[PDB]
Structure formats: C-alpha cells, structure tokens
Amino acid sequence: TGSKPFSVPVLTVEEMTNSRFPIPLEKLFTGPSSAFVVQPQNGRCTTDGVLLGTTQLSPVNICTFRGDVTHITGSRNYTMNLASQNWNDYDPTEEIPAPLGTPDFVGKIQGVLTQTTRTDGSTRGHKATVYTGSADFAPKLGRVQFETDTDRDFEANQNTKFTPVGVIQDGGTTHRNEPQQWVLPSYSGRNTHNVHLAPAVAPTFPGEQLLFFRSTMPGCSGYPNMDLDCLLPQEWVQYFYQEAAPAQSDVALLRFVNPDTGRVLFECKLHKSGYVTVAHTGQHDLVIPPNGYFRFDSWVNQFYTLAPM
C-alpha cells in the first residue's frame, strides 16, 4: 500500500537497445504467436527488478563469449573453454540456464575472435562463427565451438574473446529459414534438458497479441532471417533492476505518447512478469513518432480491456 511508484523510462524506441543482441531497437511489431513457443532467456526481468533466465545488465555483453581456445586438429575449428565475463574461472553451479548473456536462439552467429598474448602484448583477430544449434554447443558445461578462417594462428592458454556482429544462412537452401529466433539452444549440448528457464509467455486475453521490440540483425552471408524481437528493451531491464518498484497488480497500463501532438497513439499492458501485450489481430509494423515514448498511467487488473490499435 503506497509502495514506491512504478514507472518506465522516458526513452524513445530509437534511443533503446535490443535485449537479445547488441544492436539498437528499430521498431515495434505485433503479430500472432500461437504457432510457436515464445521463451527467450535474454531480455527477461520482472517489473519489480528480478532478472530472469540468462539476463544480465549491459547490452554489449549479449552473445559474447570469453575464454581459452583449443584447436581441433585437421580443421579451422576451435573449442572455447569458457571463462567468466571478468576472465575469472567459469562457475557452472549458478542456478541459471547458461552463462548470463549466452545466445538464446538457434542460429549461426558470425563475429570475430580476438586474442592477446600476455608475454608480449601481441594480438590477432579472425572471423569466427558459432552455430548455437550444434550438438557441441554446450555453454552451460563451459564449452562452445567456433569455425574460423585459420588453423594455426590462435594460441592456446591465452585470453580470447568472441564479439558478435551478425547472422548467416546457407544461400543454397530455402531463404530466411534461419536463424530461428524462437528456438532455444540446448545449453548443455544435444539431447540435454535446459534448466532454470524464464517461462514461456503468451497473450491469454482474447484479441490480444504480444508487442515485440524489434531490430534487424546484420547479415554476414547468405539470406538470413534478420528479424529479432525482444520482450523488453534492455533499458527497461536496467531500469526495473535499479528501481525495484513493487508491482501493485499483475498489469501496468502503459500509454505510448506522441509529444508532437500531445495525444496517445496506443495503450498496452506491461505484465509484471515482464512482457507486453496489445489489442490487435494480425501482423502489424507500428508506425510511431520517432520521439514517442511509453508512460506508466495505472495499475490495472489482468482482465482490463485495452483500446484497439
């Protein structure tokens, strides 16, 4: 009763960042999601600031890896034995699905593996790709594999980082068939069960759909599906974590406000467990004022009927 007032930050969509890959938000999208399970592990946080899944605070760390690399002889493939993000030993005993920031979708993520040799400060960088659907993608166990463009240049037992850039696809197969953003990796490898997951989300109220915060991942080869939808901007994760304002009901009613006109474009439900729904049926790219922003107006019940948008 009279708990610390909840709020969302005054930030435009274009001022914010995807919580599932280190790139800015571009737009808002809504569409039906009954066909598949929406259970991303990054960009998960309750409105009262409890981080969920594999969610951590800085967007730059999302889909990065750090550790030592071991060359798979007879190839240009390397196993990275993971370190903690601060370069300390990896501790797999935390009750989380995988290290915080681990990719939460199946896809071929291309980036660069960089390395510094401690003794002389010599450095090297090579194109590298991780396939998060690989049987040997096992970040929870502390190991992942990178395909690179070298078979001898990387030293073992030296600090090595993967910086993500974008995604790829096989141009010789059906275009935009991958990445598959709603398919979770098996974090401990093929045929292992994931643990400590943030739950799946779905609209339950008739006539409602999820509102997605959408970016376009860079493509590095082939014809990838570059759409990437998160449930919360990274800045909202950061803000809720910091504010830790108690939820007075299951749903915070937000209005998306247009400062150019003074009027509301649409309203939506921010669910306390950390996702947004709107009243719409069908696929729709929202056309928003670029200086528009979200504003918390009232706690409402979960069975509040939204104005259509």
Short mmCIF file of C-alpha atoms in Angstrom, two decimals:
data_model
loop_
_atom_site.label_atom_id
_atom_site.label_comp_id
_atom_site.label_asym_id
_atom_site.label_seq_id
_atom_site.Cartn_x
_atom_site.Cartn_y
_atom_site.Cartn_z
CA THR A 1 0.00 0.00 0.00
CA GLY A 2 1.58 3.26 -1.17
CA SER A 3 4.61 1.34 -2.45
CA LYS A 4 7.41 3.14 -4.32
CA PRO A 5 5.82 4.40 -7.57
CA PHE A 6 6.46 2.25 -10.61
CA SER A 7 7.43 3.89 -13.91
CA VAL A 8 9.11 3.18 -17.23
CA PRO A 9 11.97 5.28 -18.56
CA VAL A 10 11.38 8.26 -20.81
CA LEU A 11 13.22 6.86 -23.81
CA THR A 12 12.18 6.59 -27.42
CA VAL A 13 12.35 3.27 -29.25
CA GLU A 14 15.31 4.50 -31.31
CA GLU A 15 17.13 5.52 -28.10
CA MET A 16 16.88 1.97 -26.79
CA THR A 17 18.61 -1.34 -27.36
CA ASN A 18 17.59 -4.90 -28.15
CA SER A 19 17.99 -7.17 -25.13
CA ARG A 20 18.76 -10.26 -27.23
CA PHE A 21 21.63 -8.99 -29.43
CA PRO A 22 23.88 -5.90 -29.07
CA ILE A 23 22.09 -3.64 -31.55
CA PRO A 24 19.67 -0.73 -31.26
CA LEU A 25 15.93 -1.08 -31.38
CA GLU A 26 14.38 -0.02 -34.68
CA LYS A 27 10.64 -0.50 -34.41
CA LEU A 28 7.65 -2.04 -32.68
CA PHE A 29 5.88 -5.06 -34.14
CA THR A 30 2.88 -7.14 -33.17
CA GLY A 31 1.78 -10.45 -34.60
CA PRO A 32 0.18 -13.76 -33.63
CA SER A 33 2.43 -16.17 -31.74
CA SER A 34 0.19 -19.18 -31.15
CA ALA A 35 2.16 -21.19 -33.73
CA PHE A 36 5.32 -21.26 -31.61
CA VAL A 37 6.67 -21.02 -28.06
CA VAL A 38 7.94 -17.60 -27.01
CA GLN A 39 10.54 -18.29 -24.34
CA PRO A 40 13.55 -16.03 -24.85
CA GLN A 41 16.06 -16.07 -21.98
CA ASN A 42 17.71 -12.71 -22.60
CA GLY A 43 15.63 -9.57 -22.02
CA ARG A 44 13.74 -11.19 -19.13
CA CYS A 45 13.04 -9.23 -15.97
CA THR A 46 10.04 -8.63 -13.73
CA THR A 47 8.69 -5.11 -13.34
CA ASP A 48 9.96 -5.13 -9.74
CA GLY A 49 13.51 -5.79 -10.96
CA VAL A 50 14.14 -9.54 -10.68
CA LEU A 51 16.36 -10.71 -13.54
CA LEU A 52 15.31 -13.99 -15.15
CA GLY A 53 16.76 -16.61 -17.49
CA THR A 54 20.21 -15.64 -18.75
CA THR A 55 19.54 -11.91 -18.49
CA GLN A 56 22.32 -9.56 -17.36
CA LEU A 57 22.60 -5.79 -17.36
CA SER A 58 24.85 -4.46 -20.14
CA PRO A 59 23.76 -4.88 -23.74
CA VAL A 60 27.34 -5.07 -25.05
CA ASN A 61 27.88 -8.46 -23.39
CA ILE A 62 24.94 -10.15 -25.12
CA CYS A 63 26.10 -13.00 -27.38
CA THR A 64 29.74 -12.51 -26.39
CA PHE A 65 32.00 -15.31 -25.17
CA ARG A 66 35.36 -15.27 -23.40
CA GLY A 67 37.90 -17.93 -22.50
CA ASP A 68 40.76 -20.07 -23.84
CA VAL A 69 40.73 -21.84 -27.21
CA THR A 70 41.86 -25.31 -28.24
CA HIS A 71 42.46 -26.18 -31.87
CA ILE A 72 40.60 -29.11 -33.36
CA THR A 73 43.47 -30.67 -35.30
CA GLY A 74 42.85 -31.10 -39.02
CA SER A 75 40.42 -28.16 -39.13
CA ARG A 76 39.96 -24.42 -38.59
CA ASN A 77 37.54 -25.15 -35.76
CA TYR A 78 38.32 -24.25 -32.14
CA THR A 79 36.74 -25.23 -28.85
CA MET A 80 36.46 -22.30 -26.48
CA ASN A 81 36.62 -23.33 -22.86
CA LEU A 82 34.60 -20.54 -21.32
CA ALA A 83 35.72 -18.13 -18.66
CA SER A 84 33.53 -15.82 -16.62
CA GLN A 85 32.92 -12.45 -18.28
CA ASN A 86 35.52 -10.87 -15.94
CA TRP A 87 38.07 -13.51 -17.08
CA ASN A 88 37.87 -15.48 -13.83
CA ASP A 89 37.16 -19.21 -13.81
CA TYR A 90 33.73 -20.18 -15.08
CA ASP A 91 31.41 -21.29 -12.27
CA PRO A 92 28.73 -23.61 -13.69
CA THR A 93 26.98 -24.07 -10.33
CA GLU A 94 24.82 -20.94 -10.55
CA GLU A 95 21.10 -21.70 -10.86
CA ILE A 96 20.83 -20.29 -14.37
CA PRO A 97 20.33 -21.92 -17.78
CA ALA A 98 23.75 -20.88 -19.08
CA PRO A 99 26.19 -18.04 -18.53
CA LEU A 100 24.41 -14.69 -18.48
CA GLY A 101 24.28 -13.22 -21.98
CA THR A 102 24.52 -16.58 -23.80
CA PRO A 103 22.64 -16.52 -27.13
CA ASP A 104 19.01 -17.59 -26.58
CA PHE A 105 18.24 -18.61 -30.14
CA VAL A 106 19.36 -21.24 -32.64
CA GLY A 107 21.35 -19.65 -35.42
CA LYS A 108 24.76 -19.17 -36.97
CA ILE A 109 26.22 -16.09 -35.32
CA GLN A 110 29.22 -14.61 -37.06
CA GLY A 111 31.69 -12.30 -35.41
CA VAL A 112 35.37 -12.00 -34.60
CA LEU A 113 37.59 -13.99 -32.27
CA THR A 114 40.30 -11.75 -30.80
CA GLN A 115 43.27 -12.79 -28.69
CA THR A 116 46.15 -11.18 -26.81
CA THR A 117 49.34 -12.99 -25.84
CA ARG A 118 50.22 -11.95 -22.29
CA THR A 119 54.02 -12.04 -22.54
CA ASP A 120 54.45 -9.53 -25.39
CA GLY A 121 51.01 -7.99 -25.93
CA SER A 122 50.87 -9.38 -29.46
CA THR A 123 47.32 -9.59 -30.82
CA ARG A 124 45.29 -11.31 -33.52
CA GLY A 125 41.73 -11.38 -34.80
CA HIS A 126 39.89 -13.74 -37.12
CA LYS A 127 36.40 -14.17 -38.49
CA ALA A 128 34.53 -16.78 -36.48
CA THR A 129 31.09 -18.38 -36.43
CA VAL A 130 29.25 -20.22 -33.66
CA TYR A 131 26.30 -22.44 -34.50
CA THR A 132 24.14 -22.41 -31.39
CA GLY A 133 22.20 -25.40 -32.71
CA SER A 134 25.36 -27.52 -32.90
CA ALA A 135 25.39 -30.74 -30.87
CA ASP A 136 28.59 -29.44 -29.24
CA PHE A 137 27.15 -26.04 -28.32
CA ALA A 138 27.30 -26.51 -24.56
CA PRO A 139 27.80 -23.12 -22.88
CA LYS A 140 26.26 -24.36 -19.61
CA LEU A 141 29.02 -27.00 -19.48
CA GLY A 142 31.55 -24.28 -20.35
CA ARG A 143 32.35 -25.13 -23.96
CA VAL A 144 31.35 -23.93 -27.41
CA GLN A 145 32.89 -24.37 -30.87
CA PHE A 146 33.89 -21.68 -33.36
CA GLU A 147 34.53 -22.20 -37.05
CA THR A 148 37.21 -19.71 -38.13
CA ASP A 149 39.37 -18.82 -41.13
CA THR A 150 42.62 -20.13 -39.58
CA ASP A 151 44.11 -23.48 -38.49
CA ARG A 152 47.24 -22.34 -36.66
CA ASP A 153 47.17 -18.65 -35.71
CA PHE A 154 45.38 -18.86 -32.33
CA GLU A 155 47.46 -19.74 -29.31
CA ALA A 156 46.14 -21.96 -26.55
CA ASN A 157 46.06 -20.80 -22.93
CA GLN A 158 45.60 -17.11 -23.75
CA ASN A 159 42.61 -14.81 -23.26
CA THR A 160 40.31 -14.92 -26.27
CA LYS A 161 37.01 -13.09 -26.88
CA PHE A 162 34.19 -13.50 -29.37
CA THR A 163 32.50 -10.27 -30.40
CA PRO A 164 29.22 -10.90 -32.25
CA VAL A 165 28.41 -9.00 -35.44
CA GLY A 166 25.51 -10.68 -37.18
CA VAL A 167 24.00 -13.87 -38.57
CA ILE A 168 24.42 -16.07 -41.64
CA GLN A 169 22.41 -18.53 -43.72
CA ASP A 170 23.14 -21.15 -46.42
CA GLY A 171 22.24 -19.48 -49.72
CA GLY A 172 21.89 -22.92 -51.29
CA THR A 173 18.87 -23.69 -49.13
CA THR A 174 15.47 -22.07 -48.52
CA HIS A 175 15.97 -18.37 -47.92
CA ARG A 176 15.27 -16.92 -44.47
CA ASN A 177 14.96 -20.43 -42.99
CA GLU A 178 17.44 -19.43 -40.26
CA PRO A 179 18.18 -18.11 -37.67
CA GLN A 180 15.19 -19.43 -35.74
CA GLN A 181 14.80 -16.78 -33.05
CA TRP A 182 12.19 -18.66 -31.01
CA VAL A 183 14.09 -21.97 -30.80
CA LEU A 184 16.12 -22.17 -27.61
CA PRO A 185 19.56 -23.76 -27.75
CA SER A 186 20.17 -26.92 -25.73
CA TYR A 187 22.54 -25.17 -23.35
CA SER A 188 24.32 -28.34 -22.15
CA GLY A 189 24.55 -29.90 -25.62
CA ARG A 190 22.43 -32.16 -27.82
CA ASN A 191 19.73 -34.14 -26.01
CA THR A 192 20.22 -32.45 -22.66
CA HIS A 193 17.41 -30.72 -20.77
CA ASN A 194 17.59 -26.97 -20.14
CA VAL A 195 17.30 -25.79 -16.53
CA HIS A 196 16.24 -22.68 -14.61
CA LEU A 197 14.47 -21.16 -17.62
CA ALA A 198 12.44 -17.99 -17.62
CA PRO A 199 8.93 -19.18 -18.52
CA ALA A 200 7.26 -19.09 -21.91
CA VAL A 201 4.92 -16.14 -22.46
CA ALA A 202 1.71 -15.83 -24.42
CA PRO A 203 -1.22 -13.47 -24.73
CA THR A 204 -4.17 -15.09 -22.96
CA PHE A 205 -6.75 -12.32 -23.29
CA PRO A 206 -8.96 -12.69 -26.39
CA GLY A 207 -7.96 -10.23 -29.09
CA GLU A 208 -4.51 -9.59 -27.60
CA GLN A 209 -1.06 -10.23 -29.07
CA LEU A 210 2.45 -9.71 -27.78
CA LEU A 211 4.10 -6.39 -28.57
CA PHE A 212 7.65 -7.00 -29.74
CA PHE A 213 10.60 -4.63 -29.59
CA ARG A 214 12.23 -5.31 -32.93
CA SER A 215 15.66 -4.95 -34.50
CA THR A 216 17.25 -6.19 -37.71
CA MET A 217 20.37 -8.24 -37.06
CA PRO A 218 23.18 -7.58 -39.52
CA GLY A 219 23.60 -10.33 -42.10
CA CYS A 220 27.10 -11.55 -42.92
CA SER A 221 26.40 -14.17 -45.63
CA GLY A 222 23.51 -15.79 -47.46
CA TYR A 223 19.84 -14.98 -46.96
CA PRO A 224 19.17 -14.97 -43.20
CA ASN A 225 16.01 -14.09 -41.36
CA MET A 226 17.32 -10.98 -39.63
CA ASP A 227 14.23 -10.18 -37.54
CA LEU A 228 14.97 -10.12 -33.81
CA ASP A 229 12.19 -9.50 -31.33
CA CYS A 230 12.68 -8.94 -27.60
CA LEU A 231 10.01 -8.73 -24.90
CA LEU A 232 11.63 -5.78 -23.11
CA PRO A 233 14.16 -3.18 -24.22
CA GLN A 234 17.49 -3.67 -22.46
CA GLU A 235 16.99 -0.23 -20.91
CA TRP A 236 13.77 -1.42 -19.26
CA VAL A 237 15.64 -4.37 -17.76
CA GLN A 238 18.28 -1.96 -16.48
CA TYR A 239 15.66 0.46 -15.15
CA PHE A 240 13.47 -2.12 -13.38
CA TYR A 241 16.57 -3.69 -11.83
CA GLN A 242 17.63 -0.31 -10.47
CA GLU A 243 14.17 0.97 -9.41
CA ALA A 244 12.84 -2.29 -7.97
CA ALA A 245 9.39 -0.73 -7.55
CA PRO A 246 6.78 -3.23 -6.25
CA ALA A 247 4.02 -4.34 -8.61
CA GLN A 248 0.64 -3.33 -7.19
CA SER A 249 -1.21 -5.60 -9.62
CA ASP A 250 -0.45 -8.12 -12.35
CA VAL A 251 -0.56 -5.45 -15.07
CA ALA A 252 0.81 -1.95 -15.57
CA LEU A 253 -1.18 0.05 -18.12
CA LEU A 254 1.19 1.97 -20.40
CA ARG A 255 0.29 4.70 -22.87
CA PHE A 256 2.55 5.39 -25.83
CA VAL A 257 2.58 9.17 -26.08
CA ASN A 258 3.29 11.44 -29.06
CA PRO A 259 4.98 14.66 -27.89
CA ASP A 260 4.38 16.32 -31.27
CA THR A 261 0.60 16.14 -30.83
CA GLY A 262 0.14 15.55 -27.11
CA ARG A 263 -2.05 12.53 -27.87
CA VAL A 264 -1.81 8.79 -27.16
CA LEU A 265 -1.01 6.55 -30.13
CA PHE A 266 -1.86 3.28 -28.36
CA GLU A 267 -2.06 1.72 -24.91
CA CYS A 268 -0.68 -1.63 -23.81
CA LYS A 269 -0.35 -3.98 -20.86
CA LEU A 270 3.04 -4.38 -19.24
CA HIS A 271 2.70 -7.65 -17.34
CA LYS A 272 4.53 -7.79 -14.03
CA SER A 273 6.45 -10.91 -15.13
CA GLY A 274 7.99 -8.79 -17.88
CA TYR A 275 6.32 -8.68 -21.29
CA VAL A 276 3.84 -6.50 -23.18
CA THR A 277 0.50 -7.15 -24.91
CA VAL A 278 -1.71 -5.03 -27.16
CA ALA A 279 -5.21 -5.38 -28.59
CA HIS A 280 -4.66 -6.32 -32.22
CA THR A 281 -5.28 -9.24 -34.57
CA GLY A 282 -2.72 -9.77 -37.33
CA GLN A 283 0.83 -8.84 -38.27
CA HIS A 284 1.45 -5.11 -37.94
CA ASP A 285 4.50 -2.89 -38.14
CA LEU A 286 3.71 0.03 -35.84
CA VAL A 287 4.18 3.47 -37.38
CA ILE A 288 5.32 5.64 -34.47
CA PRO A 289 6.53 9.21 -33.97
CA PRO A 290 10.29 8.89 -33.55
CA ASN A 291 10.11 10.99 -30.36
CA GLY A 292 7.30 8.90 -28.91
CA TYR A 293 7.75 7.13 -25.59
CA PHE A 294 5.98 4.89 -23.08
CA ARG A 295 4.35 6.27 -19.94
CA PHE A 296 3.01 4.33 -16.95
CA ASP A 297 -0.52 5.52 -16.12
CA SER A 298 -2.15 2.98 -13.81
CA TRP A 299 -2.06 -0.47 -12.26
CA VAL A 300 -4.99 -2.44 -13.69
CA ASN A 301 -6.29 -6.00 -13.40
CA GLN A 302 -5.19 -8.66 -15.88
CA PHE A 303 -8.70 -8.66 -17.40
CA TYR A 304 -8.63 -4.97 -18.33
CA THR A 305 -9.83 -4.44 -21.91
CA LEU A 306 -7.41 -2.34 -23.97
CA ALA A 307 -8.42 0.14 -26.63
CA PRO A 308 -7.80 -1.44 -30.05
CA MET A 309 -4.72 -0.39 -32.02
#
